[PDB]
């Protein structure tokens, strides 16, 4: 008891001369203060954090290291406490407006083999672990008293100062006063909170046993651990593995992991260039065009117009407010022979965001939920795309519904639902790729019509015999990807006043003969102009213009744009008839 | 152990020896022998450096008219070979479900999640529902499945060979529409598997008493008053100590087939044959690999893999094309 704090006035005060003393570089070169210089260069920022290391403090004295592996929890707190008298001689002197000396929060990460949920054998119960694994959730944020201070009610007596123990684990109120029983309540108007979240950690895919679902644990993040990951991350934990202690079997407890370490496995001046001179370069539509289908071969105009895609047109505010479209909309229609199948991998995975789909569904909908036992409101794909891509196929498939709700949804940009008790919005801002295998309606909620063909002549044949290898023998997106967040997000092209007359006439003349075409066939089904087409025409040529970084398009892409969608909509034209 | 299996396997002719290992009792069918015994051993699962993600797993579909000892052949796999499971059609992905013991609303495998690395033995392919439709799939081409359910969502591994079974409609196989019709199935579903046989039956006289004698013969020794050693074993070796090399001789001699039978289907009414059996012949091109532990692609087993993959393509076929184009390649293909 007494030798207790006599301990630990010698283990803070070892502790102390670490963060006070460690160095790092050589003799000939030069050394620097490592801990000390990143105390003051954090403090003076308001960040109050520091992130030890555990190969240096072994290094530097072999004991402590130990300790800390050992009893984790009760020498963090002497560290905490050590690392709060150095940054007081470090930035002291404080300026005026502070002169309270924080709390650090003393972090730690290590270069050590990490452990797996499946080797947490109960010998491990409170020393610190190091395990990987994927966030699965995530709480929200909730206040967590530290320094707390009660009163009695009946006599008002005050017993102040009490600190909480850290963790999931509360308090015991006294109940003999010194009046009723238990005469104390809890003065909201004195207690320090620190924030706090709990995540959710799931086994990595790879080493699941194979035979089963994987298992997970729970976490249990503090001060300036929380909302730093995000539901779909990988990570690489420190924590001290423990039990709850809120006081199937008899003497079973419930087991979590503190975490106090966290990590995450994964634009310049100079790559900028890069960027530049490839939009200068004379050639630069077909480089990209080029490099975005290596494996499909053939016709790559179904890849010339996904090269667009990936840019997308701008987003234009009248005075009205009546903003516009700043996406496209593509339909590749053909027989369901897997050449497109990688084709929507392909655009999905170097896209900034995209996912493709085939669960909840792809719009919003209304499900009665078990627990409340009434209607909630599940917001599906084309919710969480934020300005993303989404590819779809067999759209005959979805569901009767959830196509009423797309295409409402690509009508609008939005999805309100109002229903049993649900009425919101959702803004849908991405970009549908489908892919078809149909209403003249919901055909032509689409802009550009890619349907397949091929022929059979020996020489024809040969082009198969070339295409044959291939395929049988199985510009880097990794700069594509990089290159596209930052010409999206600097260029704000518009059109010429030579483009408008040359759409004008174009147009005209489109719709000039759909007259004499459909008042004397009329074969029930055909497609004429729209303007809706028109405008998917000009939000064309911005995206083809945005290539360039060229504020200002011209009539160098206008007819090669015109001639694409002359293919586009006389393919829909043959299927239609 | 392995000191016989060296000269068993260099046999040279293992081929026959083996195939007559498999569908112990049944008689006849040395056809659908040959295709099922490709596709226990498997194939190479072989990565593309072009991030293209091919399958390394034949899936097989059976067909024909009741009483052919179909599900025998479904249920004599389920015993030889190893980790397999077994469904019918009339509980494919994780559901949540109250535990018995625990009392919680915990979530249970499927029916393809239990197959990860082995075999799933469907079983009345008809009879599946919509959603067992539109679940069965997704499965083929990406083996990987989601679930967003009411337990959690979480993204699973499935890598099965499927083995299925449907009828013909109308309690009869009738070979003069095209097997796209009396098999009652969506269309892009058949295309996801690669071999398709085609059970039928027969009146010979001389073949009635070689299966009756047979039966009767199984009758007598069965009441109360390669053998199924080596080829468990040699399944077990032979998945592990082979991994098939690809060289580039090959890569000619096919093509010559192709631009001639592209142009021989498609005169008539007919799809000829597709990137998606290339596909299914280069797959079975290791597997042999398997049998034989010979590993190396040669124009010998080239002769065998075309040779199959146009057998699973002319019996689906129409009634004069079936014989117009066996005339043309059955002869040219000099079987
Ligand atoms: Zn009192």
Known sequence: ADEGQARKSQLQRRFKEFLRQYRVGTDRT?????????????????????????????????????????????HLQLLEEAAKEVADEVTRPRPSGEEVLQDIQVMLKSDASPSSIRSLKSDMMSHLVKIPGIIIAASAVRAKATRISIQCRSCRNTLTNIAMRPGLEGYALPRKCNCPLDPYFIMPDKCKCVDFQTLKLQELPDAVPHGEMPRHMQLYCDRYLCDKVVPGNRVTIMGIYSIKKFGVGVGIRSSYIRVLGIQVDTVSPQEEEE???????????????????????????????????????????????????????????????????????????????????????????????PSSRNFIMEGGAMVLADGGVVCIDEFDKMREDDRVAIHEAMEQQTISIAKAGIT???????????????????????????????????????????????????IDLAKLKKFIAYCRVKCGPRLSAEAAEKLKNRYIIMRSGARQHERDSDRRSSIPITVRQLEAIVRIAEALSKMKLQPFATEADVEEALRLFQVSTLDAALSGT | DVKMITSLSK???????????????????????????????????????????????????????????????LKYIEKVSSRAIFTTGQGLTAYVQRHPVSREWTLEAGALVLADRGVCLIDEFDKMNDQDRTSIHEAMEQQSISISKAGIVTSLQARCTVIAAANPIGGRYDPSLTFSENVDLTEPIISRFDILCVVRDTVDPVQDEMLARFVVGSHVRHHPSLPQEVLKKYIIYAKERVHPKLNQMDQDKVAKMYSDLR????????????????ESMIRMAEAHARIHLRDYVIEDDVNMAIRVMLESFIDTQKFSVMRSMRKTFARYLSF
């Open chain 1, 424 to 474: 919101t919005t959702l803004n849908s801002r991405c970009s549908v790729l489908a892919a078809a295998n149909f209403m003249p309606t919901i055909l032509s909620r689409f802009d550009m019509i890619f349907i397949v063909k091929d022929e059979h002549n020996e020489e024809r044949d040969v082009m198969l015999a070339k295409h044959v290898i291939t395929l049988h023998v199985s």
């Open chain 2, 263 to 278: 142009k021989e289907s498609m005169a008539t009414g007919s799809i000829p044959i597709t990137v998606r059996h290339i």
């Open chain 2, 11 to 73: 046999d040279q002719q293992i081929g026959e020896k083996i195939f007559a290992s498999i569908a112990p009792s049944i008689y006849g069918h040395e056809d659908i022998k040959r295709g099922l015994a490709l596709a226990l051993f498997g194939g190479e699962p072989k990565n593309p450096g072009g991030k293209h993600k091919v399958r390394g797993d034949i899936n097989v579909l059976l067909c024909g008219d009741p009483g052919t000892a179909k599900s025998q052949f």
């Open chain 1, 275 to 369: 960027f530049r001179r490839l939009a200068a370069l004379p050639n630069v539509y077909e480089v990209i065009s080029k490099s975005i289908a290596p494996s499909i071969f053939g016709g790559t105009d179904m890849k010339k117009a996904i090269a667009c895609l990936l840019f997308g047109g701008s987003r234009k505010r009248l005075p009205d407010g009546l903003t516009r479209r700043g996406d496209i909309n593509l339909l590749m229609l053909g027989d369901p022979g897997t050449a497109k199948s990688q084709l929507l991998k392909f655009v999905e995975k170097c896209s900034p965001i995209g996912v493709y789909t085939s669960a909840a569904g792809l719009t919003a909908s209304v499900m009665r939920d």
């Open chain 1, 30 to 74: 030069g050394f620097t203060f490592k801990y000390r210089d990143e105390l003051k260069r954090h403090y003076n920022l308001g960040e109050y954090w520091i992130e030890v290391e555990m190969e240096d403090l072994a290094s530097f004295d072999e004991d402590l290291a130990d300790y800390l592996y050992k009893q984790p929890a009760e």
